[PDB]
Write a protein that holds these residues in place. Structure first.
Motif, PDB file in Angstrom:
ATOM      1  N   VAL B  16       6.081 -40.152 -36.622  1.00 10.91           N
ATOM      2  CA  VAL B  16       4.638 -40.303 -36.436  1.00 10.91           C
ATOM      3  C   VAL B  16       4.364 -40.050 -34.956  1.00 10.91           C
ATOM      4  O   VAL B  16       4.479 -40.952 -34.121  1.00 10.91           O
ATOM      5  N   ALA B  17       3.999 -38.814 -34.621  1.00 13.15           N
ATOM      6  CA  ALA B  17       3.723 -38.413 -33.250  1.00 13.15           C
ATOM      7  C   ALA B  17       2.333 -37.801 -33.162  1.00 13.15           C
ATOM      8  O   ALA B  17       1.899 -37.086 -34.070  1.00 13.15           O
ATOM      9  N   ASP B  18       1.643 -38.083 -32.061  1.00 14.32           N
ATOM     10  CA  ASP B  18       0.279 -37.617 -31.846  1.00 14.32           C
ATOM     11  C   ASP B  18       0.298 -36.349 -31.002  1.00 14.32           C
ATOM     12  O   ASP B  18       0.935 -36.312 -29.944  1.00 14.32           O
ATOM     13  N   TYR B  19      -0.395 -35.314 -31.474  1.00 14.22           N
ATOM     14  CA  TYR B  19      -0.488 -34.063 -30.735  1.00 14.22           C
ATOM     15  C   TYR B  19      -1.560 -34.086 -29.653  1.00 14.22           C
ATOM     16  O   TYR B  19      -1.568 -33.198 -28.795  1.00 14.22           O
ATOM     17  N   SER B  20      -2.458 -35.073 -29.669  1.00 11.06           N
ATOM     18  CA  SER B  20      -3.501 -35.145 -28.653  1.00 11.06           C
ATOM     19  C   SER B  20      -2.968 -35.638 -27.315  1.00 11.06           C
ATOM     20  O   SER B  20      -3.510 -35.272 -26.266  1.00 11.06           O
ATOM     21  N   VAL B  21      -1.919 -36.466 -27.326  1.00  9.98           N
ATOM     22  CA  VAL B  21      -1.369 -36.992 -26.083  1.00  9.98           C
ATOM     23  C   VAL B  21      -0.710 -35.899 -25.249  1.00  9.98           C
ATOM     24  O   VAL B  21      -0.578 -36.048 -24.029  1.00  9.98           O
ATOM     25  N   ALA B  26      -1.746 -31.763 -18.279  1.00 17.64           N
ATOM     26  CA  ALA B  26      -1.895 -30.575 -17.451  1.00 17.64           C
ATOM     27  C   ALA B  26      -0.569 -30.039 -16.931  1.00 17.64           C
ATOM     28  O   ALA B  26      -0.568 -29.085 -16.146  1.00 17.64           O
ATOM     29  N   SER B  27       0.555 -30.622 -17.346  1.00 20.02           N
ATOM     30  CA  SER B  27       1.869 -30.186 -16.894  1.00 20.02           C
ATOM     31  C   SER B  27       2.400 -28.985 -17.669  1.00 20.02           C
ATOM     32  O   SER B  27       3.596 -28.687 -17.574  1.00 20.02           O
ATOM     33  N   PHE B  28       1.549 -28.297 -18.425  1.00 21.45           N
ATOM     34  CA  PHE B  28       1.938 -27.114 -19.179  1.00 21.45           C
ATOM     35  C   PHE B  28       1.202 -25.900 -18.632  1.00 21.45           C
ATOM     36  O   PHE B  28       0.002 -25.968 -18.344  1.00 21.45           O
ATOM     37  N   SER B  29       1.930 -24.791 -18.483  1.00 21.60           N
ATOM     38  CA  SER B  29       1.324 -23.570 -17.958  1.00 21.60           C
ATOM     39  C   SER B  29       0.224 -23.062 -18.883  1.00 21.60           C
ATOM     40  O   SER B  29      -0.863 -22.688 -18.428  1.00 21.60           O
ATOM     41  N   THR B  30       0.489 -23.046 -20.186  1.00 20.25           N
ATOM     42  CA  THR B  30      -0.498 -22.623 -21.168  1.00 20.25           C
ATOM     43  C   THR B  30      -0.109 -23.190 -22.524  1.00 20.25           C
ATOM     44  O   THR B  30       1.074 -23.386 -22.813  1.00 20.25           O
ATOM     45  N   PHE B  31      -1.121 -23.457 -23.350  1.00 19.65           N
ATOM     46  CA  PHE B  31      -0.926 -23.982 -24.703  1.00 19.65           C
ATOM     47  C   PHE B  31      -1.788 -23.158 -25.653  1.00 19.65           C
ATOM     48  O   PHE B  31      -2.945 -23.498 -25.914  1.00 19.65           O
ATOM     49  N   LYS B  32      -1.218 -22.072 -26.168  1.00 20.04           N
ATOM     50  CA  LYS B  32      -1.870 -21.219 -27.151  1.00 20.04           C
ATOM     51  C   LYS B  32      -0.963 -21.103 -28.366  1.00 20.04           C
ATOM     52  O   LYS B  32       0.230 -20.814 -28.226  1.00 20.04           O
ATOM     53  N   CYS B  33      -1.524 -21.327 -29.550  1.00 19.82           N
ATOM     54  CA  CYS B  33      -0.755 -21.313 -30.784  1.00 19.82           C
ATOM     55  C   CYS B  33      -1.339 -20.306 -31.767  1.00 19.82           C
ATOM     56  O   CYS B  33      -2.549 -20.056 -31.783  1.00 19.82           O
ATOM     57  N   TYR B  34      -0.461 -19.730 -32.585  1.00 21.38           N
ATOM     58  CA  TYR B  34      -0.837 -18.692 -33.541  1.00 21.38           C
ATOM     59  C   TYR B  34      -1.226 -19.348 -34.860  1.00 21.38           C
ATOM     60  O   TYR B  34      -0.357 -19.749 -35.643  1.00 21.38           O
ATOM     61  N   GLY B  35      -2.529 -19.458 -35.109  1.00 23.30           N
ATOM     62  CA  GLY B  35      -3.007 -19.977 -36.374  1.00 23.30           C
ATOM     63  C   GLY B  35      -2.884 -21.472 -36.552  1.00 23.30           C
ATOM     64  O   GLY B  35      -3.136 -21.971 -37.653  1.00 23.30           O
ATOM     65  N   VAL B  36      -2.506 -22.205 -35.510  1.00 26.92           N
ATOM     66  CA  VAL B  36      -2.349 -23.654 -35.573  1.00 26.92           C
ATOM     67  C   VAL B  36      -3.373 -24.273 -34.632  1.00 26.92           C
ATOM     68  O   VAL B  36      -3.385 -23.968 -33.433  1.00 26.92           O
ATOM     69  N   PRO B  38      -4.769 -26.825 -32.215  1.00 22.95           N
ATOM     70  CA  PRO B  38      -4.281 -27.949 -31.399  1.00 22.95           C
ATOM     71  C   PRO B  38      -5.029 -29.245 -31.647  1.00 22.95           C
ATOM     72  O   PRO B  38      -4.419 -30.322 -31.603  1.00 22.95           O
ATOM     73  N   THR B  39      -6.336 -29.176 -31.903  1.00 14.97           N
ATOM     74  CA  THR B  39      -7.129 -30.386 -32.083  1.00 14.97           C
ATOM     75  C   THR B  39      -6.876 -31.035 -33.438  1.00 14.97           C
ATOM     76  O   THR B  39      -6.769 -32.263 -33.530  1.00 14.97           O
ATOM     77  N   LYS B  40      -6.777 -30.233 -34.495  1.00  9.39           N
ATOM     78  CA  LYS B  40      -6.640 -30.756 -35.847  1.00  9.39           C
ATOM     79  C   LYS B  40      -5.199 -31.079 -36.221  1.00  9.39           C
ATOM     80  O   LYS B  40      -4.964 -31.602 -37.316  1.00  9.39           O
ATOM     81  N   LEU B  41      -4.237 -30.797 -35.338  1.00 11.27           N
ATOM     82  CA  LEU B  41      -2.849 -31.149 -35.614  1.00 11.27           C
ATOM     83  C   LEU B  41      -2.667 -32.646 -35.810  1.00 11.27           C
ATOM     84  O   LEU B  41      -1.695 -33.064 -36.449  1.00 11.27           O
ATOM     85  N   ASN B  42      -3.581 -33.461 -35.279  1.00  9.18           N
ATOM     86  CA  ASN B  42      -3.508 -34.902 -35.473  1.00  9.18           C
ATOM     87  C   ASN B  42      -3.737 -35.300 -36.925  1.00  9.18           C
ATOM     88  O   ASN B  42      -3.353 -36.406 -37.318  1.00  9.18           O
ATOM     89  N   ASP B  43      -4.351 -34.430 -37.724  1.00  7.65           N
ATOM     90  CA  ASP B  43      -4.643 -34.708 -39.125  1.00  7.65           C
ATOM     91  C   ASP B  43      -3.900 -33.741 -40.038  1.00  7.65           C
ATOM     92  O   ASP B  43      -4.450 -33.236 -41.019  1.00  7.65           O
ATOM     93  N   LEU B  44      -2.636 -33.469 -39.722  1.00  8.23           N
ATOM     94  CA  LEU B  44      -1.814 -32.564 -40.509  1.00  8.23           C
ATOM     95  C   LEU B  44      -0.477 -33.219 -40.817  1.00  8.23           C
ATOM     96  O   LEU B  44       0.140 -33.835 -39.943  1.00  8.23           O
TER      97      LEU B  44
END
Lengths: 49, 49
Positions: B16-21, B26-36, B38-44
């Motif tokens: 049980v891990a939260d994707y919003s945290v 800001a310690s990531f250079s970029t966060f881009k996902c293909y068809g996923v 980022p906001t709704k991953l908390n409800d998947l």
């Protein structure tokens, strides 16, 4: 025909009513927490040719 | 971490891990996902990762 004269408007989160006109060609930005945690980032041009 | 030709693999499940945290960090250079989303991953719910 024009190589890059045809474009589509990439967008999300704001489901629109059918059969309405969109002329607000504005680059998508939030300037709040849900954009790289800062203001001014994630300012990508919605239109893709 | 391991090398590019010998990368390591691990099995993760029943978590049980939260994707919003991590999205707001800001310690990531970029966060881009293909068809996923980022906001709704908390409800998947996923079979395995």
């Amino acid at each position: 025909g024009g190589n890059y004269n045809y474009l589509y408007r990439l967008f999300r989160k704001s489901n629109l009513k059918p059969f309405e006109r969109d002329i607000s060609t504005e680059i998508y930005q939030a300037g709040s927490t849900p954009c790289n945690g800062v203001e001014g980032f994630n300012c990508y041009f919605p239109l893709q040719s | 971490f391991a090398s590019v030709y010998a990368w390591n693999r691990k099995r993760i499940s029943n978590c049980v891990a939260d994707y919003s945290v991590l999205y707001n960090s800001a310690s990531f250079s970029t966060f881009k996902c293909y068809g996923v989303s980022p906001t709704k991953l908390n409800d998947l719910c996923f079979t395995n990762v």
